[PDB]
RNA sequence: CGGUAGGGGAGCGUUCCGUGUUAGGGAGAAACGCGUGCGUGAGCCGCGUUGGACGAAGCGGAAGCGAGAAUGUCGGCUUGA
RNA sequence: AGGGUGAAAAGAACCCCCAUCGGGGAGUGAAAUAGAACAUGAAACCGUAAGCUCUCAAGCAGUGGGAGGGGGACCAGACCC
């Protein structure tokens, strides 16, 4: 086994190297044309190569959700997860950033929604519909409230699940993602912070 | 070309034995040592084994006599079980209606294979990759090179 | 196999049918057509229903005779075969030439089979006259 | 020596495929835009009146670019005219048009090979106008 | 009572292969006994 | 003059099958079901070629919109298009969106000197 | 120049006949399976393998002449297992 | 209901597995990828081998877009899976 394994791997390396030297691959920044001049990138609509959009290279964001509007925040969050943010957009793939939400339990809502709004899950039984209010749920598990608001705006389907994971909601103010240096989120809206 | 002389296709056929019940047994011995296979087939709890065993032993004896290579070397390369020639009895049933019961048959085939026929050639290609010993323009790299035929 | 359809055609009166044929048994013949072209032999046995004659030592044909009674070897008997009359032709053995046969009425009352090209008679062999 | 030889003979290595002028343009042809750079070919609608080998100039160049790129105020830059050569006027791969309606015995199958043209771009004639790029 | 359609293909393969794996298990066990047959057993 | 059919059947049903020989399961290998499916394949092709033309455009518009919103805080696709025609400038959506990808410098340059 | 019932025009193939005991064919026909040719399509046209002797055009003729549906029908083989 | 080994039975002496059946060498033959279940041998159906590929999925199974991977003893922005 050993002999044939090492010998096989020595061929696998060489054949890997033979192709790596056959046509090369940029990143973004760049200028229209180059010394690639292979298949027509220019009259064929752009479509991302996996080499571009790897999950390490993706940007990060943090939202402090204190004294905000739940829905208005969530739309921007959804946008920044999708990648409609970015010029290089593609519906088929996720090329969007991550999002981190903190102080989810201090998020605000207009009108008489703190009592009247109901969050329902139905166990999947002949009896069990379980329905609890906004504030009642917030006392227990406030994470959901943001999380649920966001998932409703993301595109449901195989992608919808995968790029949902990118949301990171939290109860309190501090968060454990200091390593990633997540920058602050830009916010298109006038109504987004509450009157106070 | 890559083999041709690393084998002997003994094909004992018209065995009175359903194909699925033969594939219970033959799926286990696709790629084993011949010694091991014989030890398996005598202890196994199947009617299926006996005619298989007979053909394995007949095939190995055939290989030892005819092409004259060692039984300790060889293995079972390609085992294969195909549909035979079906016979159809018409049995009665309750209330006048009648249904067929079939006597199924099979065509069993076994391709044995010596390990060490093209070993002189393969062991020589322990020589590491960037070598290309260009002697007869290309030459005899014809012995199951196995891993790649990336020769553009 | 024997083949069931291909047998002697019985007449209405339960008897097989036959062909007039240029050849007789007490006869020397050259082969015109086939594998053994040009070879010169004699007729021995004569199957009438096929128009196939049997020439002694010509259709060299091997046969794997399996042992009949005991535990012994048998042996590969190289036997003759049949051969169709149309392929064979009647040799002279004076000029050593082939022919195409014809009939004539001789002074001796009987009718006989002369040749063309050195038209010499071929009728005083076997039972004889 | 021998070590450097045989391997070199067998598995090669590539050079930077040409010189290239590297100065792009944007041309309009059959009411249809194309980014177009020199020493390079394009597929278009079959040009009615054009021969097999016959050079032509495209006078609808809405954009040009280089280190210091140059947009357009109006349409066409002004006296910029792209320089090209017709290659061949072969037809496109067959597109199968298929009328179908449910249950009415109305299957109607009909191919269509649109005639196209292959053209090869030789050079962009320089702009000499409205220098943008900051 | 009665089947609505046929399983047809691919599903019947999946069903049969587990049954052949029953055979595989028996083969393993019978292989194990051959070594026990060689030496001792008192 | 009896006329057996023979040749004429499966010489066309081979051609029928040649289409469907990438299909998955029963559809690939069952004469009459292949004949049922090929038609539908061609119909979905013909239908989606016209969906293509509008859907690519719709993608391009989103690309351009995404690109242009990164300039001024209140500047937006809708205004951008009318600003193009205000200056008389016949760049179609394809080119605009593709330059926005492959050379964002050029969109910056077009954005700079359209405003004035 | 959308199109069901439905009407009109223009074609493709199938076997057989005239031309023709044509050329083409045991240096490979009919068939059978594959084609990065052609046509608006029915279809056509070249390929070298399997195959082992038949037999294209073109101009014409004649029909047991085109199938997915008939709880059709004969044969094969599944599913339930 | 159930025709077509070959021109010729030349229908497989001998050897091996082996109680039989049947099989592999040998021998015959133009051919045994013509072995008597024998000529051309389509489809369904059943496998074996290789290339890619599914175990957080939802699907009349295709279609437009196409990530990543693989080619064809013929160096293509071409073509195929």
UniProtKB/Swiss-Prot annotation, chain B:
Cell compartment(s), UniProt: Plastid, Chloroplast
Domain of life: Eukaryota
GO annotation (BP), single: translation
Cellular component terms (Gene Ontology): chloroplast; large ribosomal subunit
Family under the similarity heading: Belongs to the universal ribosomal protein uL22 family.
Subunit structure: Component of the chloroplast large ribosomal subunit (LSU). Mature 70S chloroplast ribosomes of higher plants consist of a small (30S) and a large (50S) subunit. The 30S small subunit contains 1 molecule of ribosomal RNA (16S rRNA) and 24 different proteins. The 50S large subunit contains 3 rRNA molecules (23S, 5S and 4.5S rRNA) and 33 different proteins. uL22c binds 5S rRNA in vitro; the central segment of the protein (approximately amino acids 30 to 124) but not the last 28 amino acids are required for this binding.
Record function comment: Component of the chloroplast ribosome (chloro-ribosome), a dedicated translation machinery responsible for the synthesis of chloroplast genome-encoded proteins, including proteins of the transcription and translation machinery and components of the photosynthetic apparatus.
Protein name in the entry: Large ribosomal subunit protein uL22c
Species annotation: Spinacia oleracea
Organism classification: Eukaryota, Viridiplantae, Streptophyta, Embryophyta, Tracheophyta
Swiss-Prot record, chain D:
GO cellular component: chloroplast; ribonucleoprotein complex; ribosome
Coiled-coil intervals: none
Molecular function terms, GO-annotated: rRNA binding; structural constituent of ribosome
Protein name in the entry: Large ribosomal subunit protein bL21c
Annotated organism of origin: Spinacia oleracea (Spinach)
Transcription listed as a keyword: no
Keywords: Chloroplast, Plastid, Ribonucleoprotein, Ribosomal protein, RNA-binding, rRNA-binding, Transit peptide
Self-association and partners: Component of the chloroplast large ribosomal subunit (LSU). Mature 70S chloroplast ribosomes of higher plants consist of a small (30S) and a large (50S) subunit. The 30S small subunit contains 1 molecule of ribosomal RNA (16S rRNA) and 24 different proteins. The 50S large subunit contains 3 rRNA molecules (23S, 5S and 4.5S rRNA) and 33 different proteins.
Chief localization: plastid
Entry's family note: Belongs to the bacterial ribosomal protein bL21 family.
Function according to Swiss-Prot or TrEMBL: Component of the chloroplast ribosome (chloro-ribosome), a dedicated translation machinery responsible for the synthesis of chloroplast genome-encoded proteins, including proteins of the transcription and translation machinery and components of the photosynthetic apparatus.
Localization, UniProt: Plastid, Chloroplast
GO BP annotation list: translation
Section covered of the full-length record: 101 to 234 of 256
UniProtKB/Swiss-Prot annotation, chain E:
Primary localisation category: plastid
GO biological process terms, semicolon-separated: translation
Subcellular localization: Plastid, Chloroplast
GO-annotated molecular function: structural constituent of ribosome
Listed GO CC annotations: chloroplast; large ribosomal subunit
Key words, A-Z: Chloroplast, Plastid, Ribonucleoprotein, Ribosomal protein
Domain of life per record: Eukaryota
Residues making up the signal peptide according to the UniProt record: none
Quaternary structure note: Component of the chloroplast large ribosomal subunit (LSU). Mature 70S chloroplast ribosomes of higher plants consist of a small (30S) and a large (50S) subunit. The 30S small subunit contains 1 molecule of ribosomal RNA (16S rRNA) and 24 different proteins. The 50S large subunit contains 3 rRNA molecules (23S, 5S and 4.5S rRNA) and 33 different proteins.
Family label: Belongs to the bacterial ribosomal protein bL32 family.
Functional description taken from the UniProt entry: Component of the chloroplast ribosome (chloro-ribosome), a dedicated translation machinery responsible for the synthesis of chloroplast genome-encoded proteins, including proteins of the transcription and translation machinery and components of the photosynthetic apparatus.
Protein name: Large ribosomal subunit protein bL32c
Biological source species: Spinacia oleracea
Upper lineage: Eukaryota, Viridiplantae, Streptophyta, Embryophyta, Tracheophyta
Designated gene of the protein: rpl32
Curated annotation (Swiss-Prot), chain F:
GO cellular component: chloroplast; ribonucleoprotein complex; ribosome
Single GO biological process annotation from the record: ribosomal large subunit assembly
Main location (coarse class): plastid
Subcellular locations according to the entry: Plastid, Chloroplast
UniProt entry keywords in alphabetical sequence: Chloroplast, Plastid, Ribonucleoprotein, Ribosomal protein, RNA-binding, rRNA-binding
Lineage top rank: taxon: Eukaryota
Coiled coil: none
Any one GO molecular function term: rRNA binding
Pfam families in alphabetical order: Ribosomal_L20 (PF00453)
UniProt xrefs under SUPFAM superfamilies: Ribosomal protein L20
Signal peptide: none
Function: Component of the chloroplast ribosome (chloro-ribosome), a dedicated translation machinery responsible for the synthesis of chloroplast genome-encoded proteins, including proteins of the transcription and translation machinery and components of the photosynthetic apparatus.
Subunit record text: Component of the chloroplast large ribosomal subunit (LSU). Mature 70S chloroplast ribosomes of higher plants consist of a small (30S) and a large (50S) subunit. The 30S small subunit contains 1 molecule of ribosomal RNA (16S rRNA) and 24 different proteins. The 50S large subunit contains 3 rRNA molecules (23S, 5S and 4.5S rRNA) and 33 different proteins.
Family: Belongs to the bacterial ribosomal protein bL20 family.
HAMAP family: Ribosomal_bL20
PANTHER family per UniProt: 39S RIBOSOMAL PROTEIN L20
Name of the protein this chain belongs to: Large ribosomal subunit protein bL20c
The species this protein was found in: Spinacia oleracea
